[PDB]
């Protein structure tokens, strides 16, 4: 390629060794064209074969643990202990989808029992199943370089679904992505499958991502990042001659409601709060960004404990220069406003200071520019006049990944009113706990109403994430020999199937 670029050492701001190519529409077209060419064969593989591929990728990842961790550590400044845990998460996530595919449940086989002798017209034999949309484009998250990136949840679920994947490598961690790509390449060689099943593209020129999202052979997109770029790419996906599904997690402030009784039951609630908002130096998509509380002594004590803890926080090294500068200018800018109080920790640039904002519900209603997310070790506390004031505020919240509630049995009557409101604005409700942890299981819902997600009827994490890359096809009166195995009368795959409305 005409140009190359280097990763930035997260700790020094200087370039790290190893040059990466700056791909353009030329490579996009080649990758997409090749991906399209193997799409059909890939979705028609036996479930066990595709399941094996996912397990092999998981294994290859673990075999390169050292390289990944060392490289990702310098590119992102995330501690090694965290990266070691993320590698495992990533690997187990791949295995989870391996089980799903092998399971055959994703087929969602459904069949109507024919009825030749019904009048006036006979009831035909109809059977439907899910199949892969085709090549899928993936943009990884900068804050989770492994579990939400090259081999993250979007890639994993898309491959499981039977969709070839093309990753637009994030410029914040090119070296990490490349190693992951080397792992997937090896997995494909061992499984003896086409390399075009997975392609990693690199480049620091936005034209790349734009060309990838607009390519006619791309049939869906997975994205994790900022609302600005995320919405721009989303719009691009819907202006195409053929609009394609766009699953992007754009941001959230994850509203948290804390009742007085909860603060009494847990003396260290403030400590727990500060630990949640400062985890990963506050760089969690699920970070509790705003806390609504009642105007009682408990809250004042709570605020004071949190404040004291915030002052003691060690300097934080964020993910990218850009993310650092946005954080610095935004917190300083918000703390300048009237009606808001801010407590900062001690920190010298390039490091950033943790912050805790405090304001009243009146001012919260007055400054609508406060519901916006500020990515970093920062959070806001909104002191409300009473519970009714608190419920009123929940009615106006924007979409969020999560919504948390801290209460005891004596609050249940009001909590009962709050839940229906939170269900409407969040993808996941957390009770007497914190939103940061995200369990990769079967019941997970990671996403929610806009901006939490650009497709609230889905999840980017959990077994159900696979459905985002599938579409149903009905088969009418086809002979047994022409029907896909999943829909044959004898059910040779022995998968769960729903007949005439009865549970599978």
Which range, of 31-39, 69-77, 106-114, 164-172, touches ligand NAP by CB under 6 A? 164-172
Query: At what angle are helices 80-103 and 47-63 packed, to 10 degrees?
Result: 170
Task: Establish whether 225 is an annotated binding residue.
Answer: yes
Binder among 171, 299, 394, 453 for ligand NAP (CB under 6 A): 171
C-alpha count within 13 angstroms, C-beta hemisphere, residue 381 = 26
Q: Which does 204 bind (CB under 5 to 8 A by kind): a second copy, ligand NAP, none?
A: ligand NAP
Report CA 491 to chain centroid distance, whole Å: 35
In the bound state with ligand NAP, the residue whose beta carbon lies nearer, of 104 and 209, is: 209
Task: Establish whether 437 is an annotated binding residue.
Answer: no
Residue 235 binds a second copy, judged by CB under 8 A:
yes
In a 3-state reduction of DSSP, which class is residue 448? Answer: coil
Alpha carbon distance 115, 421 (integer Å): 46
Alpha carbon distance 147, 72 (integer Å): 12
Nearest CA among 174, 209, 153 for reference residue 31: 209
In the bound state with a second copy, the residue whose beta carbon lies nearer, of 67 and 485, is: 485
Write out the binding residues for ligand NAP, residues 209-238 only, by CB under 6 A. Answer: 209-210, 225-226, 229-230, 232-233
Query: At what angle are helices 153-161 and 47-63 packed, to 10 degrees?
Result: 150
CB of 332 to a second copy, least distance (A): 28
Say which DSSP state 79 is in: -
Say which DSSP state 375 is in: -
Residue 280 binds ligand NAP, judged by CB under 6 A:
no
249 is catalytic: yes
Residue in 60, 86, 249, 373 annotated catalytic: 249
Cβ atoms 241, 208 nearer than 8 A: no
Write out the binding residues for a second copy, residues 472-501 only, by CB under 8 A. Answer: 472-479, 481-482, 496, 498, 500-501
281 is catalytic: no
Write out the binding residues for ligand NAP, residues 186-205 only, by CB under 6 A. Answer: 204
- Angle value at C-alpha 218, between 214 and 223, nearest 5 degrees: 75
Cβ atoms 469, 132 nearer than 8 A: yes
Residue 264 binds a second copy, judged by CB under 8 A:
no
Q: Which does 121 bind (CB under 5 to 8 A by kind): ligand NAP, a second copy, none?
A: a second copy
Which positions are annotated as active-site residues?
Answer: 249, 285
- State the residues that interact with ligand NAP by CB under 6 A: 139, 141-142, 168, 170-171, 204, 206, 209-210, 225-226, 229-230, 232-233, 323
Sequence ranges of the binding site for NADP(+) = 225-230
């Amino acid at each position: 390629t005409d140009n190359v670029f280097y990763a930035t050492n997260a700790f020094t701001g200087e370039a790290l060794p190893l040059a990466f190519p700056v791909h353009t529409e030329v490579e996009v077209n080649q990758a997409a064209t090749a991906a399209a060419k193997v799409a059909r064969d890939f979705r028609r593989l036996n479930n066990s074969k595709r399941a094996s591929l996912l397990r092999t990728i998981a294994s290859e990842l673990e075999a390169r643990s050292d390289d990944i961790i060392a490289r990702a550590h310098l590119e992102t400044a995330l501690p090694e202990v965290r990266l070691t845990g993320e590698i495992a998460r990533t690997a187990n996530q791949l295995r989870l989808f391996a089980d799903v595919v092998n399971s055959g449940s994703y087929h969602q086989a459904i069949l109507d029992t024919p009825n030749p002798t019904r009048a006036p017209l006979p009831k035909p034999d109809i059977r439907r199943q899910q199949i892969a949309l085709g090549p899928v484009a993936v943009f990884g998250a900068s804050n989770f370089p492994l579990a939400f990136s090259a081999a993250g949840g979007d890639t994993a679920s898309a491959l499981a679904a039977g969709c070839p994947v093309i990753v637009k490598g994030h410029t914040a961690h090119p070296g990490t992505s490349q190693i992951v790509a080397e792992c997937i390449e090896q997995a494909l060689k061992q499984e003896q499958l086409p390399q075009a099943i997975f392609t990693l593209l690199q480049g620091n020129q936005r034209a790349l991502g734009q060309a990838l999202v607009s390519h006619p052979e791309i049939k869906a997109v997975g994205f994790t990042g900022s609302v600005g770029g995320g919405r721009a790419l989303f719009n691009l996906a819907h202006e195409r001659p053929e609009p394609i599904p766009f699953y992007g997690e754009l941001g959230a402030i994850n509203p948290t409601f804390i009742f007085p009784s909860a603060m009494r039951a847990k003396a260290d609630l403030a400590d727990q709060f500060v630990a949640s908002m400062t985890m990963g130096c506050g760089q969690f998509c699920t970070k509790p960004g705003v806390v609504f509380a009642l105007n009682t002594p408990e809250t004042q004590a709570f605020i004071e404990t949190a404040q004291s803890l915030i002052r003691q926080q060690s300097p934080s090294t964020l993910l990218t220069p850009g993310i650092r500068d946005s954080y610095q200018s935004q917190v300083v800018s918000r703390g300048s406003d009237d009606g808001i109080d801010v407590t900062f920790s001690q920190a010298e640039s390039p490091c950033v200071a943790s912050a805790l904002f405090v304001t009243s519900s009146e001012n919260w209603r007055k400054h609508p520019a406060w519901e916006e997310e500020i990515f970093g070790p920062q959070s806001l506390i909104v002191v409300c006049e009473n519970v009714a004031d608190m419920l009123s505020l929940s009615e106006m919240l924007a979409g969020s990944l999560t919504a948390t509630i801290h209460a005891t049995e004596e609050d249940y009557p009001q909590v009962s009113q709050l839940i229906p409101r939170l269900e409407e604005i969040a993808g996941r409700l957390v009770f007497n706990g914190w939103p940061t942890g995200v369990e990769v299981g079967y019941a997970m819902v990671h996403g929610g109403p806009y901006p939490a997600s650009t497709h609230s009827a889905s999840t980017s994490v959990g077994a159900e994430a696979i459905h985002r890359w599938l579409r149903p096809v009905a088969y009418q009166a086809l002979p047994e020999s022409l029907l896909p195995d999943s829909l044959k009368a004898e059910n040779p795959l022995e998968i769960a199937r729903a007949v005439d409305g009865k549970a599978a």
